[PDB]
Amino acid sequence: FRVYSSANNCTFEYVSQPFLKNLREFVFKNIDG
Amino acid sequence: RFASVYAWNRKRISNCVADYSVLYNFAPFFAFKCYGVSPTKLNDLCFTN
């Protein structure tokens, strides 16, 4: 559960705070890196 | 503390506001050499890793 797969080898760092009749709309794009 | 040579550590700095002004860390350096980049122009250039 908490650990998704067996191994998880990455060194990225990007934290923020909560992104939390309850319509939660999201749009995902990937452009210009 | 620090570490040994056979097990030298490697720290990845990839997400930071770099205050390259670590010249306060014992300014009387015994060896301050630069390869591929000049000493001060270093502070105003971008890099990935």
Nearest CA in chain B to A10: B12
| Cα dist from B27 to A5, B1, B33, whole Å | 47, 20, 14
B1: exposed, middle or buried (Cβ count in 10 Å: 0-12, 13-18, 19+): exposed
Q: Is A9 on the interface with B (CB under 8 A)?
A: no
Neighbouring residues of A3: CB distance < 8 A, sequence distance ≥ 6: none
Query: In angstroms, rounded to a whole number, what is the distance separating the alpha carbons of residues A17 and B12?
Result: 24
Alpha-carbon gap, residue B13 to B22, rounded angstroms:
15
Residue type at position A30: N
Phi, psi of B12 (to 5 degrees): -95, 115
| Cβ–Cβ below 8 Å for A11 and B12 | yes
Which residue in B10, B13, B15 has the most chain A C-beta atoms within 10 A of its own C-beta, making it the best mutation to test that interface? Answer: B15
Method of determination used here: cryo-EM
**Resolution of the PDB structure in angstroms:** 3.5
Contacts A14 to B, Cβ<8 Å: 15
